[PDB]
Amino acid sequence: SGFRKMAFPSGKVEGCMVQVTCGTTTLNGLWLDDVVYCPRHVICTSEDMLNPNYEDLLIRKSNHNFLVQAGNVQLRVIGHSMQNCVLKLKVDTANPKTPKYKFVRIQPGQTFSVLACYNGSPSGVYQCAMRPNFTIKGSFLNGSCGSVGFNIDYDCVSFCYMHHMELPTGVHAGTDLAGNFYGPFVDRQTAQAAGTDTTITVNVLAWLYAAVINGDRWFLNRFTTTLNDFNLVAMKYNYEPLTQDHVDILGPLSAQTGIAVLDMCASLKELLQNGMNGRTILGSALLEDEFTPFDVVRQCSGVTFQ
Amino acid sequence: SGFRKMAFPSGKVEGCMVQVTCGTTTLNGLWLDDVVYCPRHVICTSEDMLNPNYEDLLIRKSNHNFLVQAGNVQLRVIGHSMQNCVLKLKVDTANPKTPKYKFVRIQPGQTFSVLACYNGSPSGVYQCAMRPNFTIKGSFLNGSCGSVGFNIDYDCVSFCYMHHMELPTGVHAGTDLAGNFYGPFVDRQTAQAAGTDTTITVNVLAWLYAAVINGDRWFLNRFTTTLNDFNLVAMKYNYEPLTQDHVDILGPLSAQTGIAVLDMCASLKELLQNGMNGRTILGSALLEDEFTPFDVVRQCSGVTFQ
Ligand SMILES: *[C@H](O)[C@H](C[C@@H]1CCNC1=O)NC(=O)[C@H](CC1CCCCC1)NC(=O)C1(NC(=O)OCc2ccccc2)CC1
């Protein structure tokens, strides 16, 4: 038993991290087969940032302007191209450590692990969610751009995030691995702000099921609620609407614990209206929303990877 | 910016995990050079558990009774010995993935990353502290024994924990890698209980400094306190005594933020006496104690590893 904010083992991704230097900017790249992926703002200078035209900026570059360091081995760049907001540097060496992998664009509410890196070297791993407002609440300093977020399915790494920038509220914005920003953000120094966020309802409910699986039951009650009457309460507390599809996804957890999904919703209702009254759930004094239903099942049943 | 409960990159440890099967018991081993380390209760049967004599149990074993699987390659055992509560299985193949490593026995209050494993395959990584009562609040199911906890210093893995058992409160007990239990626990099915725990004061203070570094300051005040008068307050709230050595360790964080250690203690005093009044710190509604001063400095300055 026990329940922890668990990240995926990072080894398959660590073998892919490289350093990319162009001009006065250094950041991380992701090396898969003979391509290094990195944020295109690496080609920016301290006087391009206001309104760059990256197409113009890139046509002025030569391959030898890109300095790619994989540990203590320089990789020679033999071609480059831009895909949305990511740069793809073709190098003459295929990464022998390349895992089985996919690029995936995730939905808000989905979680992933972030391997934070500086100068191509990993610093740490932690678990994130894509917030409903398409930011992530990460931990990123200067130099961390190009760190990636990922999930693992048995032997396959699904890359879903690469880091680009920090917004004025101290939250983070980035792209999928094909260079498309999550949310309305752009890689340009202009007025940009996160916008109002909401709590991921289906995830809170999953975490309440995790609590029950692990022996916290003080928050349960005998009541039920309808989906409609629940969402009327969620609306008021800045919670995402719960859909029937959410209810179906919570089916396995409902069946394992014997607590119908709508009964768990009635418990969440009372927690929202009454607070916890100085009590904790799974070591938290807040309602936690960065565990998906799949995360709960993975951790409570012991799924492994290869 | 941002502050997350960050684990070390797990790749160097993933390359060391193996499966150890003896009789009807399967668990994980740690493969370093030509030795596999695993909990000695692997030699127990479902009718030895009450009061085993492991010396007797082990002399009855043959090398071929130990089935060691490193992925889809069986490793042949050529010798075995017992060191305290760990079994050391000598195999005919040195692990080519063996990192630079140390075995270290940590003090209560120190943190580490746990690579949770089943059948020799990693499941996830998360950050723990050794509690003052020598338990850890982990996430462990049947089959997870032999998972290890570790820290990394630049290129060296310092192994500090290997998992053995779960106590009746749902917390976890285990050994250093030389087989010595943390705390009074024994690998025997008898009445054992964690005992009263306390909050790690020096770590709470470190985390308050992390909050200041990251822009939460609402909890600061103009007051100060003496060490004595602080510890009189900590005593009452089941907090560990703060020593002068703790104060010295918090020196760098004090100097970076400009907030004297004893001034931060006065802030912690008021938080203990008044609560947070519905406010959060670094996304928590509780005072967090599983970040050491070194953890805060590592994450806020961007230390990497190789
Ligand atoms: C890359 O390593 C780095 C990481 C970043 C540093 C601090 N924390 C982080 O996560 N990214 C940047 O430094 C990034 C570079 C620019 C991105 C846009 C294209 C030009 C390069 N800069 C930022 O993170 C910042 N913010 C920003 O661009 O967003 C909008 C904004 C910022 C400030 C006021 C109003 C609006 C912080 C510059």
Ligand SMILES: *[C@H](O)[C@H](C[C@@H]1CCNC1=O)NC(=O)[C@H](CC1CCCCC1)NC(=O)C1(NC(=O)OCc2ccccc2)CC1
């Ligand atoms: C190994 O993989 C496994 C992990 C453990 C299962 C559930 N969560 C976990 O962390 N360890 C065990 O199953 C372990 C085996 C025994 C250890 C002692 C020597 C014989 C083998 N068993 C336990 O974890 C348990 N508890 C225990 O021994 O502690 C004292 C106790 C337990 C129950 C009542 C009173 C006192 C749970 C059996």
